[PDB]
Paper text:
PPKs catalyse the transfer of phosphate groups between adenosine-5′-triphosphate (ATP), as “energy currency” of the cell, and polyphosphate (polyP), a linear polymer of up to hundreds of phosphate units, as energy storage. While PPK2-I enzymes prefer the reaction from ADP to ATP, PPK2-II enzymes favour the reaction from AMP to ADP.
To better understand nucleobase recognition, we solved the first crystal structures of EbPPK2, both as a complex with polyP (2.3 Å) and as a ternary complex with polyP and the non-hydrolysable ATP analogue ACP (1.7 Å). In both EbPPK2 structures, the lid module covers the active site which includes the Walker A and Walker B motifs. From the opposite direction, a polyphosphate tunnel enables the entrance of polyP into the active site. In the EbPPK2/polyP structure, polyP11 can be clearly resolved.
Numbering used by the authors:
A (entry chain C): 2 to 303
B (entry chain D): 3 to 299
C (entry chain B): 2 to 302
D (entry chain A): 3 to 293
Write the structure that this text describes.
């Protein structure tokens, strides 16, 4: 029972989850090395997952600007080999995406069995900025859609979507990077003061600060309404980058371990065909190949 | 409607005969009524497209030669091409099987203001998928319990269709209920007319062996997923003229509940519009056709 | 059509193509009837095209606002059955579409063999509004892209793309609906004055009128640079709606007729299996089916 | 150099040996140089992603067990996940066959600022497509002349790749040139190690019968589609360490010609930014970490 894992409905108080907790590993150097170990194991699990083609994984990060989503995705999951991997940032919806229903663009990006898709922001956008700014009141919708129940029905629909995925061999890790307002300001200052990060800063990043408290409430309500055993939320303290990377590497490793991927074994009958192909290849080259069965090699002429 | 099912666990297939014609016994009457329904469907579609508020899926699920393509063609050829997609769900590709079963369906959901026609549907996964137990041969995670795969699909389908309803997309579900003898007559016709040979295949004939199991799978699907907001319509399919009539009635009545209207523009837009009108009139010295009086300053 | 078909490079003078020509059929009632005939034949060709699964067709309409694109697509092509048909309006590109290359969203919408896709506007937007407003100067691109060869390279690339399609069993009909500025103004007035058309008018429709002459020159240059025998341009006078509908029905019919679709005939071997299935079905029902060969029924009972 | 082909009709396969190692004969040296190249690739990728001006396709085309997956994995696992897609072109689906052959390729072309890796490519349609003459059995229009189908594909591919170039997308084309006996040793290894069985199939073995025809089809493709802007790289594939080294050099050298930079902001944005900085400082009692 992680102190950071939320696995039941209506069981979540945001004020109790401090942004600068570090209780799993107080020493930074220790955490950096444990993080390198976790990364090795992630890469190993990914190769087994890709080979088996049985289960898919979404790793979804949801948080305020400069909480640490891109830096964490980059530092922890750059371990992954390119095969089977997609990263999908959910930006402001296009005209076409708004003309469809809100889970249409999300479901499209769900991974294949054997593959991993990383979500930078997610379908939770529609009960975060969507609830705070009440965007549903300005968007086109049928007159029979009752505005007072739009948000409640998104919590239901999100629960049902995530459980649909679970039942069809796609897991989702949901990660809230819980950063404080002052730490966000320090990181914005850093985006302004360092040339190589200027591109990352925009007007509306600054202007969303005015809605800080409403966003905090909307995270609290979302996590209360969509945490289950099969689709838990993880609330990760985000004020220290080294710690936050450590904790995300732990969550990813532990989920891959429950999924327990293995290189597939081939059937009895395929194995027999395979032995026939082995003999043919060996005969083509008069047993001059590197077999791991040395005794048969000594049998044949040269 | 004797043909609408709008509640769970309320459906007996044996009571829904394939040759019922109780709504309209005279063929020539039904052909006339079908033409009026078609004109109204065209009118509603122009309003639905202009308003961009609600989407419609029209889904047809039935055995081979029940009448899906002939009905879609005769009833919905009235539709203008704008905002219209037709999507036949064939056997899944590799990529579709590597994704989850609703992935390819959700991708074809229409935009608000649009109509998408489904020839076969997500219901494939509790019909041929239940009868041939395809889930046992497909790749899936070890933790997936095979004994509950079908019940979980009924739940997930109900929840998916209610999600769509809540986000401005309706679905009409139509089961064309054809008898096995009538299927055989239509297959014979696909064999004996050159211009229909292309439509006949080996596996169409071979699926007849599974007739009864498919009938049970339709019964179970309709028991498990009929709701007020997402009803099933069980349409007798033994006569083409009757079946086209009934489908025209269902489509027209759904579009009328949706009640699309050309949008009215705000008072402020109307004022800018007047400014544009005066400019145009002045550019051409009042030598345009207007239906409204000209006031000058 | 034929005084209106352009099938050669650098062979196009827009001033010789009047917006109100009506020389193919001067009588409106005649043209309405000929249009209904063409429409039946289009539907018949479409069913054979769909059954054969050998060739695809793009029907692309490019023109100024209220030239008549939507109402022509609606009145002439609503004959088509829904199967195998898509309509794709090219609006201003999304973020994602701008981040990709300009033909990416067009090629995505190319139809399958046996199918018809209608383009309302097209890839030609990138040498029309794209040339007129020089949008390429503000868009993201690599430093090595030379700005004053961007448009010439689009003409080359468009020719090459269209020839690529032709070689892979997809034809394109390109139709320019050539409307006058005055007639556009009358139709805008009608969009403002009639309740049911208000939705169709926007601010920027009016403001683009200031660029009218530049747009006309850009259509001239495009047609000069991309008309070929296999990918011709059709310049259709658009000032009268009945005439424009008639002429477009003729272009679509004549193209479907060159494509010459046929219901496929099955191989000798498939025909024999089919006869075995026929006997089986007949036996299942002791010959009480509607065969086209009733003499065989006399043997049985 | 010896390995880059950048002109039409200038390519003799018999002169490009599978076990050449002339760029770096010492394996340990090549492993070290490979680590340096990989760090530089990561740095370039971050700048390419930030600038959103140019896209990069890295396409690998070769026989089974030439080394495509293991090279892609060992060299490009350095890359961060952001802006990266890997796309294997397997046998076309019935929907992909109902479209034209470049349709599924063009769909996967990357956005500006992004990198897409192709395992196999559009060249499939003049390799297995030429060798097995698949075009004769596929649906097409009656007017398509079968005797010119392949030459029109060379033209169309040249024009497609030139189109991409002109719209900010480069393609690296890499042929991993493996010998038949080395393929057999790697297939043997896929059969003898349980952990690799999944990688082996019946049809991998059966394609060997067409080895010579496939060699001729790679020769013809490289003759027909090598240009200055879209060159081919013929990389000897018989040793994995050497092949990974050379591919890291090609990717690095291409990123360096593209020359991505973190974008510079305008004078006016810099000033707004100063205003935001003072505000943030004032909101907190000047209590923030700054230079
Ligand atoms: Mg990586
Ligand atoms: Mg129609």
């Amino acid at each position: 029972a992680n102190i950071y894992k939320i696995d039941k409905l209506n069981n979540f108080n945001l004020n109790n989850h401090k942004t600068d907790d570090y209780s799993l590993c107080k020493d930074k150097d220790t955490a950096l090395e444990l993080t390198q170990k976790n990364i090795q194991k992630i890469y190993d699990y990914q190769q087994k997952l890709y080979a088996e083609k049985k289960e898919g994984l979404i790793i979804a990060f949801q948080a305020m600007d400069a909480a640490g989503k891109d830096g964490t995705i980059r530092e922890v999951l750059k371990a992954l080999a390119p095969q089977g991997v997609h990263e999908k940032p959910f930006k402001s919806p296009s005209s076409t995406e708004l003309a469809h229903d809100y889970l249409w663009r999300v479901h499209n990006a769900v991974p294949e069995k054997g593959e991993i898709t990383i979500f930078n922001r997610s379908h939770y956008e529609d009960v975060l900025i969507g609830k705070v700014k009440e965007l549903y009141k300005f968007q086109n919708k049928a007159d029979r859609i009752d505005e007072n129940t739009v948000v409640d029905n998104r919590y239901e629909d999100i629960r049902n979507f995530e459980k649909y995925l679970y039942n069809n061999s796609v897991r989702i890790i949901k990660i809230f990077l819980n950063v404080s307002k002052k730490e966000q300001a320090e990181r914005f200052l850093s985006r302004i003061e360092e040339p190589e990060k200027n591109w990352k800063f925009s007007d509306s990043d600054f202007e969303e600060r005015v809605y800080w408290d409403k966003y905090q409430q909307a995270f609290e309500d979302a996590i209360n309404a969509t945490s289950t055993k099969d689709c838990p939320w993880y609330v990760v303290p985000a004020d220290r980058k080294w710690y936050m990377r450590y904790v995300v590497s732990e969550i990813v490793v532990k989920t891959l371990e429950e999924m327990n991927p293995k290189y597939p074994t081939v059937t009895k009958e395929t194995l027999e065909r395979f032995e026939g192909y082995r003999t043919k290849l060996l005969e083509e080259y008069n047993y001059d190949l590197d077999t791991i069965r040395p005794i048969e090699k000594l049998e044949h002429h040269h």
